[PDB]
Design a protein around this ligand. Sequence first.
Ligand SMILES: Cc1cc2nc3c(=O)[nH]c(=O)nc-3n(C[C@H](O)[C@H](O)[C@H](O)COP(=O)(O)OP(=O)(O)OC[C@H]3O[C@@H](n4cnc5c(N)ncnc54)[C@H](O)[C@@H]3O)c2cc1C
Ligand SMILES: O=[NH+]c1cc(C(F)(F)F)cc2c(=O)nc(N3CCN(S(=O)(=O)C4CCCCC4)CC3)sc12
Length: 425
Amino acid sequence: TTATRLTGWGRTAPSVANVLRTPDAEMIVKAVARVAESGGGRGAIARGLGRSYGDNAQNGGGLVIDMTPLNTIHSIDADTKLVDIDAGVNLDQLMKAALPFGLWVPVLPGTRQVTVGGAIACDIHGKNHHSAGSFGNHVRSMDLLTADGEIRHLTPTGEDAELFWATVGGNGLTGIIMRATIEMTPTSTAYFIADGDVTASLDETIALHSDGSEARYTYSSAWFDAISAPPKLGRAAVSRGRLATVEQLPAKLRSEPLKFDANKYTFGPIGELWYRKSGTYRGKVQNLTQFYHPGFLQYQFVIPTEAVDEFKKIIGVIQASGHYSFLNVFKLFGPRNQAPLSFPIPGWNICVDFPIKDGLGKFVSELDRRVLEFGGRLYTAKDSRTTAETFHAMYPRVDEWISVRRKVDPLRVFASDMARRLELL
Ligand SMILES: Cc1cc2nc3c(=O)[nH]c(=O)nc-3n(C[C@H](O)[C@H](O)[C@H](O)COP(=O)(O)OP(=O)(O)OC[C@H]3O[C@@H](n4cnc5c(N)ncnc54)[C@H](O)[C@@H]3O)c2cc1C
Ligand SMILES: O=[NH+]c1cc(C(F)(F)F)cc2c(=O)nc(N3CCN(S(=O)(=O)C4CCCCC4)CC3)sc12
């Protein structure tokens, strides 16, 4: 145990906590039993690799259990497609161990430096959400250490389904996920076949994503112009694809198919042509880094699908705001799952990255308001400054969730800055 100052990736909202770090699960079981006996008393919260920007993995004046020591891969099985892994396993470790079995991590986020625990607790998503859903959809079982000190073996359709789906996306506030079983996606290669497309306006970007062409791709995302004024506003470089088969690989690659490996023109018409040519293509074979991985306030929201005029209004609001975001990711989500606090819903999702400067705070509070008004929501993994009232209206099943949480932790053994800020205890 060590008094430490914790922050999310965005290095904001620091608090000091007693960070327990042990590879012995039993010591984690005791640590919880010591907290549950001494009242709530600021409680405890699990931490993974600290990739949430927010305050969901910190607990000012309480216990923070570092789960990364507990990183044993117990088994992988290519016939069942199941991996059995401790919660502190990360998706890069997992991805590399699973490939020799013909198995693919079913949901990968923009970084592979996240733990399995954090992937479940934030119910993370990726470029294949419209074809695969989020991470919780592929969990077949997890062992949850609850406030009573018992370890419950939960399944998605068992008798404890309710607690299972409260843990999916429950930012650790139902207990510590010790271990889980995931169903992987079968693959014969570590490569993608990608199609690329460049649009010139927001209206075209929208139109490309509503042709029906998204149904031909399992992975899809886009880089998104949020600075340029209309008509350029919302032009995008779209990148869509599928996991390749061995047959579609070049000869050089079919022997190890599963192995993991002019500036004055830029803003002128010649730059426009180059960007469009380089960004337009078909059938390009790419490994994971090339396909998936090509001071600040990180902000992410989704607008339900039908509300397209509303989504266009929000992009216009951002462009006229005087806050310039260069690194913006756009994607059309597909169906949601049954976790009450799961962030993804079918509709228009986008991430923006704002330089911290005067007026930004108040401008993002207004963004919150328009996002809420238009039926959307923010992502806890990206947030540390929204209000409980805003969050509770964005998430109309919160009360349903809070009820489950109070049954399993009546003494508030599990707690985080986020839970206090967002009124989730
Ligand atoms: C560069 C970057 C790109 C990202 N891209 C994406 C993306 O494409 N899609 C997406 O959905 N997210 C994305 N994220 C967010 C990230 O995937 C999530 O925040 C994820 O939860 C981080 O995992 P972690 O192990 O770092 O968890 P932490 O940040 O350490 O913790 C996050 C939450 O998980 C809980 N938790 C962790 N381990 C356990 C456990 N064993 N038991 C119970 N609760 C636990 C914590 O209590 C906390 O509530 C990105 C983040 C960054 C920095
Ligand atoms: O956040 N919302 C997202 C939503 C999706 C979705 F919807 F498709 F699923 C996908 C992604 C993704 O795939 N990757 C992301 N990253 C964030 C930061 N960086 S960086 O910009 O590359 C780098 C920063 C510092 C130096 C300069 C460049 C690394 C990657 S975010 C993201």
